[PDB]
Ligand code: HEM
């Protein structure tokens with residue numbers, strides 16, 4: 343019966359957070375209740391926000407919330423603008439979205455990404471070989487964390503090599519993939535570009551649709567560069583973590599998933615969803631048309647799902663984190679990201695004698711005015 347007053351609209355200004363420190367404003371919101379309302383720097387008005395693990399899964403996996411409708415107005419957001427108007431996989435719903443994700447799904451499953459494990463391991467060794475030959479002072483990001491993800495995706499996409507330059511500038515290729523995809527599009531290849539090529543041939547997807555997806559995947563590696571950057575900043579600044587991984591290599595896969603759960607991958611929240619019809623969440627009525635954001639970072643610190651949520655526990659048993667999202671729009675690169683992280687931890691922790699930061703932890707530069715958090719550089723040193 344009794345009316346439940348709507349939450350006050352909380353303003354969430356863009357703030358550059360140090361290292362991997364948690365956003366105090368998000369903490370405030372997490373403590374206010376499961377359903378809040380926020381207003382970000384750009385776009386207009388307010389949007390709902392859910393922070394609990396169960397509500398985050400509900401909103402991201404329920405058909406009643408859509409992505410296409412976000413383009414119908416200026417939904418309050420962190421990013422200055424929403425250039426990927428239409429066509430981008432993130433802004434598509436079940437009909438078109440499903441066709442697009444299905445065309446390449448097989449290459450990104452656990453078994454799919456295992457295809458490039460061997461070659462990727464070798465590619466990483468060449469990068470580490472070079473860093474070691476050059477001598478101790480090194481920016482781990484520039485020498486390994488940045489180039490490795492790019493090399494890996496090229497192998498998975500089924501592209502030869504030199505596409506990196508364009509990738510770094512993206513900080514051209516649209517035309518490149520248009521060629522490869524639309525000029526080979528029917529081979530039974532297993533690589534991503536072949537799969538897309540084939541799909542386009544079977545009228546499953548459009549050439550433009552295929553190119554757009556190809557571009558997102560090709561440059562999605564920076565996410566691993568930034569995230570793994572935080573992983574190593576943590577492993578080096580907190581030696582007990584690195585020493586446990588050197589002491590018990592068997593725990594590396596689980597440790598990596600725990601690091602992925604904890605690391606605050608982005609600033610604020612990303613892309614909202616629109617309630618296509620009225621929806622009830624924890625006694626709150628979300629009206630059709632309202633925007634609803636989910637915070638995967640907050641969800642990953644849910645005290646019920648992850649007891650002692652702020653502690654990094656490599657032995658954490660049930661670890662259903664949502665760092666790669668949830669629902670239909672869940673990250674296609676999640677399995678590939680775990681593979682890259684696994685190879686990186688192996689190489690960095692086993693092949694660099696006496697590895698440590700070349701500066702105080704607080705002196706490592708992190709990206710400012712960014713959407714995805716991470717170091718701009720990670721200076722390290724070791725015994726030559
Ligand atoms: C540890 C590194 C990564 C993290 C933490 C991460 C995280 C995320 C998250 C949280 C989303 C949003 C899900 C949503 O909309 O609810 C997402 C989407 C996406 N990610 Fe990643 N990602 C990572 C690496 C990658 C890589 C390497 C690629 C490229 C192979 C990639 C490609 C994508 C794409 C294409 C989407 C959009 C999916 C869709 O809307 O259907 N991600 N990612």
Ligand SMILES: [NH3+]CCC[NH2+]CCCC[NH2+]CCC[NH3+]
Pocket residue numbers: 695696697698699700701702723724725
């Ligand atoms: N504030 C960090 C600066 C560290 N400078 C270290 C010079 C020594 C390099 N050898 C490191 C091997 C570790 N046992």
